Amino acid sequence: LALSLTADQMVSALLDAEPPILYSEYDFSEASMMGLLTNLADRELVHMINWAKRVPGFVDLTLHDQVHLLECAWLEILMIGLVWRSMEHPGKLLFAPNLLLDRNQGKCVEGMVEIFDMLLATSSRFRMMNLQGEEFVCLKSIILLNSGVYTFLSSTLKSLEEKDHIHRVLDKITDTLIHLMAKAGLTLQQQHQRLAQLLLILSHIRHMSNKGMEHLYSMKCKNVVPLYDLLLEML
């Protein structure tokens, strides 16, 4: 299974799991903008499910746990992927090949400019660090597995083994990240520094997800179960 994979074997697995890139429904008040984004998120979300299944180790976990991971990670994963796509588009966000939005077009939705700025800062940092695809894909898997691991129900011998498994795979991806960096020619010190630099960014992506989530939660009718909830429901 996933624990005996080599670093090359893991990068491959991860690159192959990558889901196709989605298009938007076509390029401006609050409702029209939130509709595009909401539509794109939901389709990305449906793709995210079969991606997660292709991630080494994810499928060894019980369903309710798989679902908990996605519940906790889905907006982060959407965001890192956006930030990655927007890397070579300074001051802009590439939601889709046909939806490239301005810093300013965030102002279309009271609340969203704060969030656009954070995404722009994140992708700017990735550009400075010259983040690579092999690393991007690794980060994305770390988010999937780490964002929900501290919030299970650890009262049980089975939730212990679940946590233990996830942490073992997380170690394997760390091993993989270092492996990529050693191959790229960085020194030990540079390796350790880049590892840290990248994992600290994951803290900011968490922050952004929390904020996006809080904004989502305050915009919606409270009598409404949003589509992310339902999908994880029917799972």
Ligand X SMILES: CC/C(=C(\c1ccccc1)c1ccc(/C=C/C(=O)O)cc1)c1ccccc1
Q: Residues annotated in the binding site for 17beta-estradiol, as ranges?
A: 44, 85, 215
**What six digits make up the tokens of 89?**
């588009």
Q: Which of a copy of itself, ligand X, none interacts with 49 (beta carbon under 5 to 8 A by kind)? A: none
Task: Write a three-state SS string for 115-181.
Answer: HHHHHHHHHHHHHHHCCCHHHHHHHHHHHHHHCCCCCCCCCCHHHHHHHHHHHHHHHHHHHHHHHHH
Which residue's entry shows tokens 């390796």?
Answer: 191
Q: How many residues bind ligand X (CB under 6 A)?
A: 17
Phi–psi pair at 99, nearest 5 degrees: -145, 85
Could you list the residues known to form a binding site, using ranges.
44, 85, 215
- Does position 228 bind ligand X by CB under 6 A? yes
Closest to ligand X by CB, 44 vs 162, is 44
Among 95, 126, 136, 152, indicate the residue that binds ligand X (CB under 6 A): 95
What token pair was written down for 171?
Answer: 């170690």
How many CA atoms are closer than 13 Å to the CA of 189, on its beta-carbon side? 0
Per DSSP, 29 falls in state -
Site membership for a copy of itself, residue 206 (CB under 8 A): yes
For ligand X, the closer CB: 80 or 169: 80
The answer to whether 65 and 124 have CB atoms below 8 angstroms apart is no
204 sits near a copy of itself (criterion: CB under 8 A):
yes
Site string for a copy of itself, 96-125 (x = CB under 8 A): ---------------------xx--xx-xx
Identity of the residue numbered 78: L
CA distance 44 to 70: 13
- Give strand pairing partners of 102: 92
Bridge partners of 94, per DSSP, are 100
Measure the N-to-C terminal CA separation of the chain; round to a whole number of Å.
24
With CB under 5 to 8 Å by kind, the binding choice for 175 among a copy of itself, ligand X, none is a copy of itself
Q: Per CB under 6 A, which region of 4-12, 130-138, 159-167, 223-231 contacts ligand X?
A: 223-231
Q: Which residues bind ligand X (CB under 6 A)?
A: 37-38, 40-42, 78-79, 82, 95, 112, 115, 212, 215-216, 226-228
Q: Which residues bind a copy of itself (CB under 8 A)?
A: 117-118, 121-122, 124-125, 142, 146-147, 150-151, 154, 167, 170-171, 174-175, 177-178, 188-189, 191-193, 195-197, 199-204, 206-207, 210-211, 214
